[PDB]
Amino acid sequence: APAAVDWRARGAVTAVKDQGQCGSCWAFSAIGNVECQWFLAGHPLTNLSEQMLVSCDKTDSGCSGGLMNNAFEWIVQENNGAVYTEDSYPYASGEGISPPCTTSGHTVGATITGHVELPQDEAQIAAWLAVNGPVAVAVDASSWMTYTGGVMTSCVSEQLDHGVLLVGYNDSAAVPYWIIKNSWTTQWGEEGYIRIAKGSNQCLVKEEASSAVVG
Ligand SMILES: *[C@H](CC(=O)N1C(=O)C=C(OC)[C@@H]1Cc1c[nH]c2ccccc12)[C@H](CCc1ccccc1)NC(=O)[C@H](CC(C)C)NC(=O)[C@H](CC(C)C)NC(=O)[C@H](C(C)C)N(C)C
């Protein structure tokens, strides 16, 4: 695996979003992953709809939480692999109330065929990411509140409660790290990103890693 990867530098990552006062993290992570996979399968960078998942995926629980893997399953088994554009299906749960699933039509922005669950192993996730792109992961984000910058090295790592997107890593640094996209605006952390130390399962980063499959 390479020493360092940042998918943002290939132009593969969309702007940092704002989930607002809704517990839709799982959807931002899932959709983040799909946006990057669609881009890397050859299509142009498209912003996709989280609201689709929050309002329409009934295996998950909207503003009350969910799981990226359930979202990937819902997309494939209940929605024929289709993911709508953000433009046609925009986010409306910023105040913490999800609207009902829409009964209009929307523009399809991407299509997925499945997802893979990655091993529970930081090095193998890194290798898979170098080859195939950004990975949806669950983390314990209890200690993320106070984070302003740097590489977090004492992340409380007791219970998975948050979903985010790995976009890179650096194995060469003094303190190796993952580069993680969050959904709490660009005013949080490092322009909306966080670096956590790599190699010591910080925030339980390795426990629940996965990705949609395009094509
Ligand atoms: C997304 C995370 C989130 O929005 N967060 C935070 O983690 C921290 C935040 O702000 C500080 C925001 C809002 C927030 C969450 N807790 C608090 C407390 C106080 C202030 C602000 C906040 C959501 C959050 C769900 C939620 C919503 C309202 C209140 C509490 C929690 N997290 C998830 O959806 C999470 C993501 C997984 C780990 C990828 N999913 C779960 O926790 C589910 C919960 C079910 C679906 C209700 N649990 C599991 O998936 C779990 C495992 C991993 C299989 N189960 C099945 C045991």
From Swiss-Prot:
Glycans are attached at N47, N170. Disulfide bonds join C22-C63, C56-C101, C155-C203. The active site is at C25, H162, N182. Belongs to the peptidase C1 family. Purified cruzipain is able to degrade itself, yielding a complex mixture of small peptides, and a major 25 kDa fragment. Hydrolyzes chromogenic peptides at the carboxyl Arg or Lys; requires at least one more amino acid, preferably Arg, Phe, Val or Leu, between the terminal Arg or Lys and the amino-blocking group. This is Cruzipain. It comes from Trypanosoma cruzi. The chain holds residues 123 to 337 of 467 of the full protein.
